[PDB]
């Protein structure tokens, strides 16, 4: 029995829009993320796979989602961290542009099925 952890970033702004990336499902719309490595927590996490893959430092940040999944001799958790305020701008760092996309038009369908319950949360408040 092995975890795997993924680390994953909401990020939004001041103007109801978060930044989401699009896939070559060849174009639904992910949040970017990554791998918990070992003797790393959580947060840590966060912030690395946020510095590598966007460019940004996390400042302001709090848990928004957990998702857990048993297999066999395989555990996920899937962290959805809600972030605010960091330092930097947003950008395919790694060869990955991402977009801005408004809350107000974005459907879950257009998601991979695992962020239904993410979506859903970002749209009500
Ligand atoms: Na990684």
Request: hydrophobic fraction near 40%; charge should be negative; proline fraction near 7%.
């Amino acid at each position: 029995m092995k975890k795997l952890q993924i680390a994953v970033g909401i990020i939004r702004n001041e103007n109801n829009e978060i930044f989401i990336t699009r896939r070559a499902m060849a174009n639904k719309l992910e949040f970017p993320g990554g791998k918990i490595e070992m003797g790393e927590t959580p947060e840590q996490a966060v912030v690395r796979e946020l510095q590598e893959e966007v460019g940004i430092t996390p400042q302001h940040f709090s848990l928004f989602e957990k998702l857990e999944y048993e297999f066999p001799d395989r555990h996920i958790t899937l962290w959805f961290w809600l972030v605010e305020r960091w330092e930097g701008e947003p950008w395919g760092k790694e060869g990955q542009p991402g977009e801005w996309m408004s809350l107000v038009g974005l459907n879950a369908d257009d998601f991979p099925p695992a962020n239904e319950p993410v979506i859903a949360k970002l749209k009500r408040l």
